[PDB]
Ligand binder design. Sequence first.
Ligand SMILES: CC(=O)N[C@@H]1[C@@H](O)[C@H](O[C@@H]2O[C@H](CO)[C@@H](O)[C@H](O)[C@H]2NC(C)=O)[C@@H](CO)O[C@H]1O
Ligand SMILES: CC(=O)N[C@@H]1[C@@H](O)[C@H](O[C@@H]2O[C@H](CO)[C@@H](O)[C@H](O)[C@H]2NC(C)=O)[C@@H](CO)O[C@H]1O
Length: 151
Amino acid sequence: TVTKPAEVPSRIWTYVMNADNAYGKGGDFALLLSAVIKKESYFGDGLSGSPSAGDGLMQVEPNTRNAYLSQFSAKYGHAYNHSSEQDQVYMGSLILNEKIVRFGSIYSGLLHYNGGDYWYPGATDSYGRPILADQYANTVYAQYKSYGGRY
Ligand SMILES: CC(=O)N[C@@H]1[C@@H](O)[C@H](O[C@@H]2O[C@H](CO)[C@@H](O)[C@H](O)[C@H]2NC(C)=O)[C@@H](CO)O[C@H]1O
Ligand SMILES: CC(=O)N[C@@H]1[C@@H](O)[C@H](O[C@@H]2O[C@H](CO)[C@@H](O)[C@H](O)[C@H]2NC(C)=O)[C@@H](CO)O[C@H]1O
């Protein structure tokens, strides 16, 4: 059985569970999306001061959001609204789920979520920061496991 980790705030859990339902994941994707958002934005409390603050809860970069708009709209029935927190989480979900499916694993989905499909040790993000996509996937997967992930 799955349950909200006590550290995850109510409003976030609602958002990821809605994402989880849109994928039929039995509550398990919700746990992985919780781990992702904690690392990415600290639920929103870890955004301010960073140059990528404006990219929201799952930290999807502007050019990445642009690439997935029509896909977002098909999956969820409305045009992506970056001001909607629920949409931000819906957008990160769709992309993460697309990588997990495409590459065949959670770990690999996580690595290429943070680094893109062509990440190499040393590559930089849209802000020019180093992307440590291996470390990201290790510690996000550990987190997902602690929260009860089964897969
Ligand atoms: C030292 C440390 O742990 N800093 C954390 C940051 O890693 C985290 O930043 C987010 O990191 C992702 C890479 O791990 C980025 O893709 C994402 O853009 C970035 N978020 C921001 C707002 O810059 C922040 C956010 O919670 O928390 C620290 O724990
Ligand atoms: C969650 C997130 O936004 N991850 C970012 C990656 O998408 C991103 O990758 C780059 O994204 C574009 C997606 O349309 C591609 O045009 C581009 O080719 C791709 N780069 C690579 C190396 O695959 C990276 C880098 O900007 O940042 C992540 O945060």
